[PDB]
């Protein structure tokens, strides 16, 4: 398999109780520093050395997710440390995270059609859906014990689903074997959140997932631009 | 395929009685008045027909209160969530659990009986019961690997039980595949709590649930009107 | 599959915040304990009029320091006890660690009374089970449990007569411990995370270990029982609460 | 099944941050109170009413374990409450605990049996604790086995512990009805590698291989009362 | 089913409390960083006299920020390092998030040395594996694991000759990533919650994903492996600390 950018899903909850105690002046300074940090990220993306986006997560799991993509673990780890060193980061409590690397099955690494997948531009879709997953190794339902022939056939039929949801849902698959607790981090983008439920359900009735898919938690959110972050942190 | 309605937020909170006690009577009253106006705007959204909301006092240590909110978009639902947390009193309402889903039903949308289910008016029943569930995918007991006909039969016989409790137990089924950790969010309303125990027990002896259902935690509570909030928060 | 249901129950486990408690002066500790004694006397009044029950046991281990087992005829009454308790000044030092909600349950697998076109709730023998007076046994044992639904071992796919047989044989063991162990079975399907909440009372702790062990070799439990956490404790009277909260 | 002393495994973590903020004056006073506490524990030991020991645990699970044995649940709980009421206990955060009773699958007045039911804790250099239960999962159901089969398994299992005798001392505490697992196993040895050897060897015997379910494992080093002041001294 | 055992191991995962650390002035932060430096210099001495090893990596994600992998020849020494570490003033800002105790292990499935009535612990080649020098690779990968004992897939019920074949085929994959991935196998049966603590080192993190994936398709792991949490990190030298702890 061919690998692309290293990915970080960073889920945060806003400590409103502490944030409320800050005067408007200091709240302004911390947001000013954040905007500067966000402009930094934008520059890295403009030179094609990374990607990033922010979505507001629903429910008590988190308030925000910071999805970041970079060319190396060193180039990903300093973003994480640089972010935590921000003043406002004290009010962004860690609730969950995920580490992965963009994954995909004559040089392919120059094929500009393949580059668009390994180093994907993040679409500004209204909504986002994230969940980790793994392939089962339980009794008769053991994905990794399947023959090469049958196992590939399951992947074939599975791919036809996402193929049918083209223009409705965009997927980013990140392998996490050796990097995190599950085997894949799946990120979905769409302007209609209902499409997330439809594709994952339709997938769940397909044998590939119906028999071998193990799922972690599901996180769903809405697009959050810089022009929306200010009113968000304004009580 | 299914039909979807309002997006749902079950927001469970525990009351920080230790912290709340430290507030003088004056400050406690101001925060209640701020909450009162918040609920007033919730009532506006309810009247205009762009959602619903209700509050119940939960029994046990899982929570003290549940804020069940329904809206016509995820943006609107996240708005209520953040706006709620920005309240002064919210600092004393600690998050213990939450669930995200959308009202689900298996043209119809302009059929005045269907929309009544997809956009349900919350009845002022004396008790509520909530629990998340999922259909199992474990060996011989795999719901999503069953033939279509066998599935319909199991759903059919399951449906027979629900209609037998009509007039005693009102249900709201919220699909959460792609939205949360389980596959459905079940909400029951009844004036007799024991009806919850009767319908869920009877269901559990039906094959659809007996063989294929997985259950999360169960939350039961009592109806709490806005007028009774002042008395509740008075030590 | 049918049940007779009595009092709604609350097992309220609490841990004592000794760090915060030792900061109060004896005068303030006295006022809080005074308010608690009043609260507990209120509970006793409800008991004396036959509209509920309550008891306190000291739990061993880090799971909890105290359990407050309370029984009431409605969830509105039960919740009110809960809210009223937390509003106590001393409750700020009683940290929640675990709880359970159930209702006293009598299943119809075996009979509890003669069936003669007759109202069971008027049967005093039945009422003594539905609305049980709590015995002042020296020790308590609580654990939630459920019936498995796992492949070949699926309790809820069994025929009625087969479940009857299993409950019957299970019962034989249960009644061999009559006079040594008293049992309160609370159904919690639809009310909590497990399907039942079992409370045992005895003047000898080892009896808890004996009955549960012997049950575990009986097919009803050996094959179909799924257990949660176990809690063991000692009876705590009001006349030794002041000694407990005194450092 | 014969039953002896009631047991408490009390695992604690040291709040170094809060402990550091205390000036050495308070720290010494709290350590003195703990010394008087442990002094009274030794009296109970010498008269023959109970036992106690302390071990420094490795890893983040805990820093210390207080293993206490008493004749009744009243006395055990009293020590537990007496311990928490100590000023120093505020800096000893609870991380894990276990309740059991010394189990032995008129014998009660025989010195030989009493040595088992009411065991003196050896001052071995190391300790190992883990809870466990017997499986009731599908075809692997220990409690649905015929007695004759179950007896042979226990017999084949017993042979292992006896070969490790003198190198590893074991205290089995039954916890059915008392805690979340069915047994609490405590091992003592002057060589921690012996723990790894006996548990490994046991796990290949059909009794544990097929029917054992384990909880968390805790390893620690012997810690005397005189070593506490230098442990808590930064 | 014997093993050769070397240094006792401690993986100490920590997270940086940036909020509290920020409140500290650079004068005090400097002082704590200096104390940490003297601590690591003492660790270097122990390493130079040959009484153990130690290294530090920066973990990615919220699981941790740092891991302090330490190796010693006794549990007394290993626990003293642990106690000394926490007694550091800077340690208050290093919150414990996870840990794993184990000992460097060589299984007897395949031979590590030739026969001869010849003590293996005197073999220079064996000692190099039991008391391994930590390679300064760019990245690290740690994960605990255990062999399954679930129904048909029961590793500990397998015949010896079958476990051998499985480990043999398993070893071929590991031996194929030579010069790219170095492995430290720490046995933890009786020491921690899993049966092994596996530590990988490589200058290319993708090799971790490559080896574990290929391994997971081999029957030994495809059928019998149980995995815990995975931790991925970047190498961090003592001179890089002050850089890291500068806001
Ligand atoms: K949120
Ligand atoms: K409550
Ligand atoms: K206790
Ligand atoms: K430790
Ligand atoms: K990190």
Numbering used by the authors:
A (entry chain D): 7 to 111, 122 to 251
B (entry chain C): 6 to 111, 123 to 251
C (entry chain A), E (entry chain E): 5 to 251
D (entry chain B): 7 to 111, 123 to 251
Give passages from the manuscript:
Chlorite dismutase-like proteins are structurally closely related to functional chlorite dismutases which are heme b-dependent oxidoreductases capable of reducing chlorite to chloride with simultaneous production of dioxygen. Chlorite dismutase-like proteins are incapable of performing this reaction and their biological role is still under discussion. Recently, members of this large protein family were shown to be involved in heme biosynthesis in Gram-positive bacteria, and thus the protein was renamed HemQ in these organisms. In the present work the structural and heme binding properties of the chlorite dismutase-like protein from the Gram-positive pathogen Listeria monocytogenes (LmCld) were analyzed in order to evaluate its potential role as a regulatory heme sensing protein.
A crystal structure of apo-LmCld was solved and refined at a resolution of 2.0 Å. The overall structure of apo-LmCld subunit is composed of an N- and a C-terminal ferredoxin-like domain, as also observed in other Clds. In the crystal lattice apo-LmCld forms a homopentamer, compared to the hexameric assembly in solution. No electron density corresponding to heme was detected in the active site cavity of the C-terminal ferredoxin-like domain, despite the presence of a potential histidine residue as proximal ligand. In functional Clds a hydrogen bond between the proximal histidine and a neighboring glutamate stabilizes the position of the heme ligand. In contrast, an alanine replaces the glutamate in apo-LmCld. The distal site differs in having a glutamine residue at the position of the distal arginine which was shown to be of high importance for catalytic chlorite degrading activity. Moreover, similar to the Cld-like proteins from T. thermophilus and G. stearothermophilus, apo-LmCld contains a flexible stretch of amino acids between residues V105 and K141, as indicated by higher temperature factors and weaker electron density for these residues. This flexible stretch of residues aligns with the substrate channel forming α-helix of chlorite degrading chlorite dismutases and has a major impact on the access to the heme binding site, as shown by tunnel calculations in the respective proteins using CAVER. While in NdCld the access to the heme is very large, in apo-LmCld the access is significantly different and narrower, since the flexible stretch of amino acids is positioned in front of the putative heme binding site, as also reflected in diverse characteristics of the access channels.
